[PDB]
Amino acid sequence: NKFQLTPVDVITAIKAQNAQVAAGQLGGTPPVKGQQLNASIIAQTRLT
Amino acid sequence: LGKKLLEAARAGRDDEVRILMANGADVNAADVVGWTPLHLAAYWGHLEIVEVLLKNGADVNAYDTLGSTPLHLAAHFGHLEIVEVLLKNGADVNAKDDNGITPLHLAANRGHLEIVEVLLKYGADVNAQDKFGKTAFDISINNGNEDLAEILQ
Amino acid sequence: STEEFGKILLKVNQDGSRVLLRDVAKIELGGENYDIIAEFNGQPASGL
């Protein structure tokens, strides 16, 4: 209450900041020919 | 009486349609949505039944409960020969349905270039707007139909 | 069809000009994924 927050805000923040987020790949198919590197992009992963 | 003819026109039964009118069936009979035998023949693409129906005094400008005519249907579904026959027999080329949609709008939307030309030949208002202010040209631009866009200029 | 997807309306500008999907993207039929490419005796192919 001091910060005008509720459990709704707590839940929303946890769901946003403790999550697995899909990204993609560098040089993924279909590529520009001449691409020399293909690598997965890792974005947000769950807290620990 | 007319129900027999409405079905026979739909099924495309040339003989049946003749026999039913030799017996004096109403040629402007309407079904539950206001479609006449000429509507059905135009929709399903039965040119012979269209001709034989018009010869017997079919109302060529009949409109259904939403205001669409057989010319709307024939133009919409790419039935070139039926469009010509209808127009030859006095079909309102600028007929608007309840939405303000004309046969040119419908032909334009489906990219029936040949049918568009026939409609313009018979005096279709290229600047006619539907309820949303759209012309056949607006439709051709939105659809990206280059061939049609130039024909409308 | 690609034609129908291309004319998906994204927004209308204040001048009334329309932004369609084909104005921000190329629209084509293409593989669900592009990872597998097969050849039969050196010639392009598919298979099961």
Swiss-Prot record, chain C:
It is found in: Cell inner membrane. Induction: Positively regulated by MarA, Rob and SoxS transcriptional regulators (at protein level). Disruption phenotype: Loss of susceptibility to contact-dependent growth inhibition (CDI); inhibiting cells still contact the target. Homotrimer, with large domains that extend into the periplasm, interacts with AcrA and TolC. AcrA may be required to stably link this protein and TolC. Interacts with AcrZ. Part of the AcrA-AcrB-AcrZ-TolC efflux pump. AcrA-AcrB-AcrZ-TolC is a drug efflux protein complex with broad substrate specificity that uses the proton motive force to export substrates. Belongs to the resistance-nodulation-cell division (RND) (TC 2.A.6) family. This is Multidrug efflux pump subunit AcrB. The lineage of its organism: Bacteria, Pseudomonadati, Pseudomonadota, Gammaproteobacteria, Enterobacterales.
